Every structure is written in C-alpha cells, then in structure tokens.
Design a protein around this nucleic acid. Structure first.
Lengths: 70, 64, 74, 88, 166, 135
RNA sequence: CUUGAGUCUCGUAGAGGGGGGUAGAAUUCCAGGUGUAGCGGUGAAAUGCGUAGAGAUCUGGAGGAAUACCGGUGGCGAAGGCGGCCCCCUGGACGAAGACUGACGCUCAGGUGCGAAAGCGUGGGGAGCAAACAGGAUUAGAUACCCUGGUAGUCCACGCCGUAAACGAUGUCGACUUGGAGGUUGUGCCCUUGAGGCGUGGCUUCCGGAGCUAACGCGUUAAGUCGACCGCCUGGGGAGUAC
C-alpha cells in the first residue's frame, strides 16, 4: 500500500501519505489471524470511542489554566 | 537482498529499471533504495499490491 | 425574502451529491480519490443516508467496471 | 401490501355499502385478502420463517375481530365466516 | 451551634469506638475512630462520625459533626404521630404511632439511645443490615417528615398547612 | 407498471450481434404492455478493469418498464448474453425515466471519448444509429 | 363516546426473511515461457516442502468460500439475530394527508411457530483455514505453551432434538417526570447559508436535576413514579447431575 499514483517530480521515496485513502484497514490489517464474518461490527468500529479521550484532553488544557497550576 | 539481485543482471546487459511493489512488509522504501544504488532511475514505483475482494482465511497462529 | 429554498451552501455546508444513482459516472467520482477509491465518512462529514446508499452504488459501479475495485486496477 | 383494484372490490362487497375500510366485517375481509396474498408467497419459500411471524400477527388479530363481532351481532357474523370460507 | 435545637448541656452518647490501620507503608496507624449521637430529649437529627490520633480528640471531632448543620425536629417529648418508612443504606426501620403505656424492649445500648431520642414508643425491630453504624438510624430518616399534634383541630391539621401555601 | 433502469455494456468486436437481439427484447417488453421510455446508447468508454477482456466497452441504457414476472427473465437474459460482458438493473425507488443524469456524459462520449476508429464504428450500428424490426 | 386499540390507499429509511442471477483479485493449481537454491517458521528453533528445478515472475486457463473499504455515536430483525452486487416473492417498522370502526383492551400457565455457532444424515462441493492424527519445539517434565504437515468441518440444498455469555448480563406492553445538546431521518417554515435554527413525529447518544442504589450505575429510550398480569430466586460444596 505504497499506492500507484506518482508524487509530482519523481523521487526514490514514495509519498505514501498523500496517496492512500482507505487501503489496508480490515483486509490486510488482521494478518496471521482467523477471519471472522460479523465480528468487525463490534471489534473494529471504535471511532466514536477514540474521539472522546481527544475531546477530554483538549478540554483539560484550558482547565489547568482555570485552576491556575500553569 | 535488492543489491544482490541488481548486481547479477549486468551480465544479461540490462541498463535501466522500473519497479512493481506488492506487499505491506518491511523494505517499503529500503528495497527501492538498493536498486537505485545499483545505478538505476526508479521513477515508477507502481504499487500493484493485490487487494483481494476479501480472500482466503489466514492461519490462526497461537491457540489462545 | 421568503421561500428562496436551497439556492447554495444552505441546509448543510457540504452539498449531498447523489443517493443511489450510478449511471452518471460523475456523481460517484464526487467522493473518489485520485487512487480511484472512496474517502472515509468521518473525514468528509457527509450525512449517513447519502453514504449508506452510495456504499451499494459504488460496489455496483465498481462491478460494472465503471471504477477500479483493487489497487492492481490503477 | 395488496393491489389497489382488489382493495376497491373488497370494500364494494364487504362491510356496509358506504365503501369504508374501518368496520369489523370489512377489516376481516381486508386482513383475509393480505393473508391470502402472503399464502401466495408460501406456495414456495417454505424456509422463509421471519415473514411467517407476520402472518400470525394478521391471523391472531382477525381471531380477535371475529370474537368482537360475535359478542355483537350474529347475522353479520354467521354471514361473514361462511362468506370468506374460513375454518371447517 | 448554627441551626441546632434548644439543646442545653451536652449529650455525650458515645455509641461505638474502633481502631483502623492498613499498616502498609510505615508500621501501623495509632489513630482511633468514634461514632457519637448528640440530641436533646425532644427530637434531633444529630449524628456525628469523627476520628483523631487518640480517643479524647476522636470523640470531640465526632461530637462537633454531631451538632453542626442539624435542623430542629418538633416532636412532643415522648409522643410522635407521623413517622417515615425509614431506609438508610440497606438498614431499614418501620415505626408506627403507638401508646407509651405499653413499654419498650430493645437490645444492647439501644433502649437507652431510643429514650433520649424521644422515639422509643413508635419503634419496631430493625430489618436489613444489623451493622452497629446504621442500626441506630431510627431517629433520622424515620423522622425526616413528621408532625406531633396536641391540637383539638387534628382533623383540620393538613388543611392548615395548605392555606399557608396559598 | 414498475420501472427498471437496466444498464449493460458490450464488447466492441461483438457489437454486430446486438441489432438482431435488441428488437426481440423490446417486443417481449411491449408484448407485456410495458414501455421503452428512452433507450439511450452512450458510445464507447474505457473500463477500469477488463471484463471478458479488453479495456473498452460500449454502454447501452434501455430504460424499461416491464412487469415484475418479465424483468426477472430479461435480467437473467442480459447477464448471460455473451455479446454483453456484464449488466446491472436498479430499483423502482427514486427512479427517473425523463431528464437523464447521463445526457451530457452521452453526448461527450459521441463528440470526444470514443476511439474514432473501425473497432468503434462496429459500436455505432448498435449505438444511437440503431436498427430494429417494427412492432 | 374516544381517551385505549384496530384499518384503507400514499410517501420514507434500512445489512429483516426465502429462491434466482453475476464479476474480478491474492493464496491455490496446471500448462507453456523465463530463471537458480533455498522456500517456510520463530522468542530462537527444528519438523514440512524443494534440484524430478522449488520459491518467485510473464501469459493464458482452472476452481471454491469470500467480497475488505463505503461500514458511521448509522439503520434493521421477535430476543440471540442481519453486510458483495442485482432481480423475483414478501414481512415489520417510521412519517403524512383524506377517511372509517369505536374498549374490538392488557398480560399470559398450557400452547403452536421460529438456531449465534458448531454437532448432524445423504447428494452436490473443496481454494484456503482447522479439532483429531503424525512429527517438530518448549522444560524439573510438557497432553497445556509454541511451530509445521493434515482430515471431518467451514460451503450449498433439504432434513434431526432448538444449545448458549439466547444482551439492556435489564419481563411484556402502556401512562407520567426541569432538560440541553450530539448522531441522523419523514415533513412545515428560514438570506434554508455553520451534518445549523424553529414546528412536529422517528430511531440513536453524551451530559446532568428530582428519585433510587451496597457500589458502580440508571435518569424522560430508568436502574425513577407507577400500571396490570406473568416468569424466576431463597446459604455454600456435591448437581444442570440423580429421579
């Protein structure tokens, strides 16, 4: 998943980030493991859950200021 | 491994190269760098890595 | 003044383009990268219906070789 | 789901002559008419159990609406039950 | 103290004493814990759990917590008419109006706590947890809404409380 | 009746087969009192991946109404046509039979996106330059 | 009577169910072409496989499950349950306008009907993965741990007792209780201008008051206030067995 689309002016290092959009996730990610049929619906779909801790972290920066520790 | 194969093919009289990449394993760039150190332009790094439409079940590995 | 109703850039900031249509090639390509593939739904802030119906339409379209299914088809 | 053109014949023939859908007689006659449509699917599809769940809803409710008419007038009832060929 | 009832000399009802330690980080803890009730004979909510390094300081902390931010409770000495189905943290009590002519049986120190509580006569045996800390809650949650009328107008009594809300 | 938007694509060199087949399929529809409400041929287009080989196909939008019993037989038919490489038919819900979403993409194809070659001349006699027997 | 509930055509959202049709891609395989020595496996390792030319690679064919992403705090099903894409057949649910009947109600012992998964009889089918079975490796031994081969299974069709961690670990369906806001949809109204606002239903979720809790927690989708009627529990081990 270095991705076929060529970075402007050719160089030895592939610009892997700007190319990739939805590759590996689910298909070539659960490597050397038993593939399940309905398991992904609860195992993998953790985007909302992982978003909360990041909202909390960005809240507390302002709250260290309001308590005055900084 | 790339610098070992790239040395041997001068006898075949190859003078330029292009490369096809197929996998998620290590050597993403480092394999490319060794053909480029063999004296080749390596402008076309065409990922053709086959994404089956969800293929054949991989091995369970450990029994836990 | 009243009843202007959906000129531009109003109801939603991002226009919904298609639901379920695939006979125009251009409507599908509205959410398709230069890699030739769908962008995830978290990043764009698309509304779930237009997306849920596009999940069928895009797979349909790919199967008719209106799209690449696979990185090998780039 | 039942055809527009049957539903209008059923209304013409059953309940009173007002061509309403609400009275107990026309409601047995409309329920029957979907039950029969669904039995048309169950000419095949013998492993299609999740839709059979639906049949028993429509069937049970008709059982209830028959008790109700028979708790009320017996003329409408003895006519209706013979008029849709229900039971043995 | 503050909102406390018309109390006169201290109630020194010590109910329990204990001593607690983890001993995990630097030998044992020497400090003691105390549980104390301070009332007035006419009905109070005063209950105080406190602690200090040795008993005399433990009780005096506990006795402060038995007496500050405590509301007056208006029962008439030994008669009460309107209890509550008392619940505190699984320890459950269910008093109902009753003659004082009949006497009181209650075990341990408890007939003694109840006679200073003013609630001895309405009282009936505890159920739920029979833990020393929560068994005595008869006079707190079991009086949390109450009245004790002496008036001939007892049958107008709830009427009298509505026309003040009017 | 109910409306079914069938789209199919055809191998360039095999396009010569379709002008005899298409007029029996239209007679089978109207023979059931359904209708041809457009019939748009779009010309040749590049497939992303080959299907039965070649990177190119010629795309044809029939725009049927036919009864439910008949479309299950026609759909099986259009998929197992050999001249046809693959086919898809979409639902009655949210369907247009007027005002085509591909009207511009079609015209663009004839003007600009064909080969303009002998292998796409073969398409144009099965294309908009359509010939069929009269019903 | 409507204030409970029921029903007609219409719109709307969705992975509810049964049977049909269909494509490409890696492992895998075969054939030819090209080509030489490891390939595999791991914590490190050896068993396996290979010079009959492996491994990989070009072209073309073969075959069977599967169909990633889109897939999201989404949506759906009676609970567990549902995900390639399409059609045939059809349920259940969400709204909305015209219109009808008018307690036709609630719950449910017994009851008929219905499987996550594998177990399972025959036919069809097999590419990969795998209990057993062999052999390697681990170590005070090693059936556990960790590896390689490898079969029934997995896959379809019909058929046999519906097991369970069969979910809200939360009975059924109904009434009431300060709310805001997120996700997202029917529809009235908005320079619709901020997945936005307001009017009114829809599922869905964070936050917290009244109340309830041992505690976590629940909180207008309750774990509150309750409603009718039902299921179920009454110390542990020994027993989901004995009878």
């Amino acid at each position: 998943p270095v991705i076929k689309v060529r970075e402007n002016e050719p160089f030895d290092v592939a610009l892997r980030r700007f190319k990739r959009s939805c590759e590996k996730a689910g298909v070539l990610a659960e490597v050397r493991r038993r593939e399940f049929y309905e398991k992904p619906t609860t195992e993998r779909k953790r985007a909302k859950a992982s978003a909360v801790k990041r909202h909390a972290k960005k809240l507390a920066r302002e709250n260290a200021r309001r308590t005055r520790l900084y | 491994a790339a610098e070992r194969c790239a040395d041997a093919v001068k006898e075949y009289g190859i003078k330029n190269l292009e490369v096809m990449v197929k996998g998620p394993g290590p050597g993403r760039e480092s394999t490319i760098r060794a053909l480029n150190a063999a004296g080749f332009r390596i402008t076309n790094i065409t990922d053709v890595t086959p994404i089956p439409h969800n293929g054949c079940r991989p091995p369970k590995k450990r029994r836990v | 003044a009243r009843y202007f109703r959906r000129r531009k850039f109003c109801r939603f900031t991002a226009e919904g383009v298609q639901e379920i249509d695939y006979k125009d090639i251009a409507t599908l390509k509205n959410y398709i990268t230069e890699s030739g593939k769908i962008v995830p739904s978290r990043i764009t802030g698309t509304r779930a219906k237009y997306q849920r119906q596009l999940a069928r339409a895009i797979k349909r379209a790919r199967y008719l070789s209106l799209l690449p299914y696979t990185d090998r088809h780039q | 789901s039942l055809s527009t053109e049957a539903t209008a014949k059923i209304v013409s023939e059953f309940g009173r002559d007002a061509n309403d859908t609400g009275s107990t007689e026309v409601q047995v006659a409309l329920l029957t008419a979907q039950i029969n449509h669904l039995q048309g699917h169950f000419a095949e599809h013998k492993k299609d159990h999740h839709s059979r769940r639906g049949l028993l809803r429509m069937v049970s409710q008709r059982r209830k609406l028959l008790d109700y008419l028979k708790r009320k007038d017996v003329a409408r009832y003895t006519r209706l039950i013979e008029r849709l060929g229900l039971r043995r | 103290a503050h909102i406390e009832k018309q109390a006169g000399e201290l109630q020194e009802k010590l109910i329990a004493v204990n001593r607690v330690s983890k001993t995990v980080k630097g030998g044992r803890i020497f400090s003691f814990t105390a549980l104390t009730v301070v009332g007035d004979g006419n009905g109070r909510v005063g209950f105080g759990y406190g602690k200090a390094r040795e008993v005399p300081a433990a009780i005096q902390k506990a006795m402060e917590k038995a007496r500050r931010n405590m509301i007056n409770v208006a029962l008439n000495n030994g008669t009460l008419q309107h209890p509550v189905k008392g619940v505190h943290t699984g320890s459950r009590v269910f008093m109902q109006p009753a003659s004082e002519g009949t006497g009181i049986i209650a075990g341990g120190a408890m007939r003694a706590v109840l006679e200073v509580a003013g609630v001895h006569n309405v009282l009936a045996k505890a159920y739920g947890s029979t833990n020393p800390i929560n068994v005595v809650r008869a006079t707190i949650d079991g009086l949390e809404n109450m009245n004790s009328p002496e008036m001939v107008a007892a049958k107008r009594g709830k009427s009298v409380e509505e026309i003040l809300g009017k | 009746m109910r409306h079914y938007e069938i789209v199919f694509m055809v191998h360039p060199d095999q396009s010569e087969q379709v002008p005899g087949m298409i007029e029996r399929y239209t007679a089978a529809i109207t023979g059931a009192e359904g209708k041809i409400h457009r019939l748009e041929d779009w010309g040749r287009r590049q497939l992303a991946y080959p299907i039965n080989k070649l990177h190119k196909a010629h795309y044809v939008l029939m725009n049927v109404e036919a009864p439910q019993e008949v479309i299950d037989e026609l759909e099986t038919t259009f998929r197992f046509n050999d001249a046809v490489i693959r086919s898809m038919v979409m639902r009655t819900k949210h369907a247009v039979t007027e005002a085509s979403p591909m009207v511009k993409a079609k015209d663009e194809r004839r003007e600009r996106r064909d080969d303009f070659a002998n292998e796409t001349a073969d398409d144009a006699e099965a294309g908009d330059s359509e010939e069929e027997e009269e019903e």
